[PDB]
């Protein structure tokens, strides 16, 4: 049981806390005397249950939980996939190819190029850029239930930071094991955010909608809107940067309406430590806190879009 309270700050009532200062009992190395230690959890990681206000971990009622070892890192490194003896891997070398059909210029390789396993949603990060004009790929364009993978030609500079100098408290749940809690925050209580240059994004979106008209009519209106709803991993730009798991609001990126014919865009990013990626139940991972402000610059190289069924099909 976690007896939490608001983090030390000065109002307003719209800050809706987000960061909670939790105190609880804990088992030491010995199997006797207890331990009154405190931590600092995000709002998405805890959940109250009904004297003070009482919380609990959001996964305690779903599955077990394991802490990531601080020795390993979540840095996506290039991995070449190769074929055994007697087999071969064919590579399509045309500059325009939607992924399906016969390929004019085919070459064979033993090992593919360096593909970094970047786990992300909505925004494809650090991928291979397409050739000449941007490509639009889909298993079934007529089906509004099949996703639409987009590939970019020019990379979109994205800047993400974690404006919170966190402190790593290493409480000892011995013998052997050790939990890495979040101590007090050095500085101001700010939230993570990601910046995208309005100039780069305007050109990228206009190059995609001009390619979308090659499939939805030459003179048609294409409108962009944010996600419909559901899990947090589907409605937000989920990614990893510096060990932490960001969840950014992409309502400022998909707010436009294009007809047939100088600063940065800041996006609200939340951070969750206890995750259950890949629709996996039974294995919950606690990402250990990371000391210091985390900064990362990535390349926006593609999108994963879905189309609505409301139609009114030949109009917009």
């Amino acid at each position, epitope marked *: 049981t976690l007896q939490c309270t608001n983090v030390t700050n*000065n109002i307003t009532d*719209d800050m809706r806390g987000e960061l909670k200062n939790c105190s609880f009992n804990m088992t030491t190395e010995l199997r006797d005397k207890k331990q009154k230690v405190y931590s600092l959890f995000y709002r998405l990681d805890v959940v109250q249950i009904n004297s003070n206000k009482e919380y609990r971990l959001i996964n305690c009622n779903t599955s077990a939980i394991t802490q990531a070892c601080p020795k390993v890192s979540f840095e996506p490194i290039p991995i070449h996939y190769c074929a055994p003896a007697g087999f071969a891997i064919l590579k399509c070398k045309d500059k325009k190819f939607n992924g399906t059909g016969p390929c004019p210029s085919v070459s064979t390789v033993q090992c593919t190029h360096g593909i970094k396993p970047v786990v992300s949603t909505q925004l494809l990060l650090n991928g291979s850029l397409a050739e000449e004009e941007v490509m639009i790929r889909s298993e079934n364009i007529t089906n509004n239930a099949k996703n639409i993978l987009v590939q970019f030609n020019t990379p979109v500079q994205i800047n993400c930071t974690r*404006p919170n100098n966190n402190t790593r408290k290493s409480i000892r749940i011995g013998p052997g094991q050790a939990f890495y809690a979040t101590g007090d925050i050095i500085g*101001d209580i700010r939230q993570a955010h990601c910046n995208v240059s309005k100039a780069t994004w305007n050109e990228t979106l206009g190059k995609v909608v001009k390619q979308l008209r090659k499939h939805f009519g030459n003179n048609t209106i294409i409108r962009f809107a944010n996600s419909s709803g559901g899990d947090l991993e589907v409605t937000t730009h989920s990614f990893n940067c510096g060990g932490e798991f960001f969840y950014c609001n992409t309502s400022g990126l998909f707010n436009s309406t294009w007809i047939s014919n100088n600063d940065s865009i800041t996006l609200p990013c939340r951070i969750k430590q206890i995750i259950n990626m890949w629709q996996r139940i039974g294995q919950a991972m606690y990402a250990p806190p990371i000391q210091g402000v985390i900064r990362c610059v990535s390349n926006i190289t593609g999108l994963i879009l879905t189309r609505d069924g409301g139609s009114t099909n030949s109009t917009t």
Partner: antibody
Amino acid sequence: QVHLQESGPGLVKPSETLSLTCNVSGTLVRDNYWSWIRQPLGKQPEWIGYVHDSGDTNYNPSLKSRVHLSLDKSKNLVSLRLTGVTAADSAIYYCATTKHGRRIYGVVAFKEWFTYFYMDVWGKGTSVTVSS
Amino acid sequence: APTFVSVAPGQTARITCGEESLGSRSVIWYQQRPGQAPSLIIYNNNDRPSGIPDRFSGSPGSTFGTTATLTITSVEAGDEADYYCHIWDSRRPTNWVFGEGTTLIVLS
């Protein structure tokens, strides 16, 4: 030139209501912020609260349920009221103009800032002693 | 409660007031000569208004974990007064009481 003059009773009985007045000459009471500062003998100055037009007025959490401030736009002066005075309220009350400032540390848009006040033009001050 | 700092004339005086820094500060300093009203010396950590010499300098409100310090270069007999500070921390509520002052003694 900005001249401020404080005037009060000087002696207020215990459990009474202290009333002070800051006669302002040189500026309008609507175009500035106005603050009151108290100071016991041999202690650090204690901020009483700031008053401004359009309802922007906040008080000292320590003196919330005892202080009342007002601005007279017809007589061009600042008023002060303190109900239930004791021996701890015996101090020197000042009236000073107040300029506001805004300190930005975050991304502005996320209300990652705070407003700080500072007095630049003070007055001579009035003496208030609480005794029966 | 009271503190004292004695500095020879022409040297440099430094004054500590207020609690330890917890966040971004906006320390406002004031000087009070005996028997008179408080005057503004340095507002917003190290910003001096019109009329204040460059001899009065304050610690920047960007250092986390230090107390407010007022540096006075070329100490003269005229600088002998009381100095108060108004701590503006972003994690602490508005301090309606100035920090405890420090008295400057000009030696010789």
